């Protein structure tokens, strides 16, 4: 695990990007550009995480509700469906997390999200797009300290509720290997940005974390990030 051939493996995607590693406190950069790690993103399809704890906690839904689809024109196909909080986190289906999103309300939201203290804490004025467009803003670092606190469920909320969440994002399970993530994808900056944010369940149960973050362009396929990461974390030897 050569901090150089993970240079080589961006040089190559024509992206500019970090890869964030946290092992018990301990983190390491990883990439071509690693000072996206203390840059300030929007978050995107990554708070949907924060979002999912923040309504279990505070009992504006539960993993049993079904969210219905009321008919109308949505920005992925797979998004037209009636639809499960667990399932809408699978598919990054935006619709159901912004009818989440505005049950929690304002005042709850900027509480919870100032409490919990994820990115500068900003949610400004739209209760239901503050993590698509700003003002939400988090650093790569940042991320990963989150999604190491909810593996190791060290995050101020129920220890089932981080159950729950957890349980939402199992990403491929091979080889005695669990590897848990979130997706994000910020089309709508200049330029794109990427998120891949999860950790490693070693078969021992040793935890740790990513945060990959990559500057984007319209024609990558969505599992560019996958790609990256899977032969990113082989290289360290993590699988
Ligand atoms: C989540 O961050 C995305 C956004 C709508 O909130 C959804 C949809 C895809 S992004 C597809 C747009 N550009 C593609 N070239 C997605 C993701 O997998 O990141 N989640």
Do not use: C
């Amino acid at each position: 695990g050569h901090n150089q051939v993970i240079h080589q493996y961006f040089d190559e995607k024509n992206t500019s990007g970090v890869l964030v590693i946290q092992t018990d406190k301990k983190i390491n950069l990883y990439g071509n550009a690693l000072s996206r790690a203390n840059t300030e993103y929007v978050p995107a399809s990554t708070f949907k995480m924060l979002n999912a704890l923040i309504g279990l906690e505070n009992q504006k839904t539960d993993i049993n509700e079904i969210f219905k689809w009321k008919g109308e024109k949505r920005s992925a196909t797979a998004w037209e469906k009636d639809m499960t909080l667990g399932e809408a986190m699978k598919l990054s289906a935006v619709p159901v997390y912004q009818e989440l999103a505005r049950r929690i309300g304002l005042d709850l939201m900027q509480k919870e999200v100032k409490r919990i203290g994820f990115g500068n804490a900003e949610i400004g004025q739209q209760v239901d797009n503050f993590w698509l467009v700003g003002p939400l803003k988090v650093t790569p670092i940042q991320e990963v300290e989150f999604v190491s606190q909810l593996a190791h469920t060290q995050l101020p909320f129920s220890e089932k509720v981080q159950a729950n969440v957890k349980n939402m994002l199992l990403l491929e399970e091979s080889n005695g290997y669990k590897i848990f993530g979130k997706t994000g994808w910020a089309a709508d900056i200049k330029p794109q940005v990427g998120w891949l944010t999860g950790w490693v369940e070693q078969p021992d149960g040793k935890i740790v974390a990513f945060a990959l973050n990559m500057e984007m362009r319209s024609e990558m396929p969505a599992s560019i990030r996958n790609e990256l990461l899977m032969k990113s974390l082989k290289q360290l030897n993590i699988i």
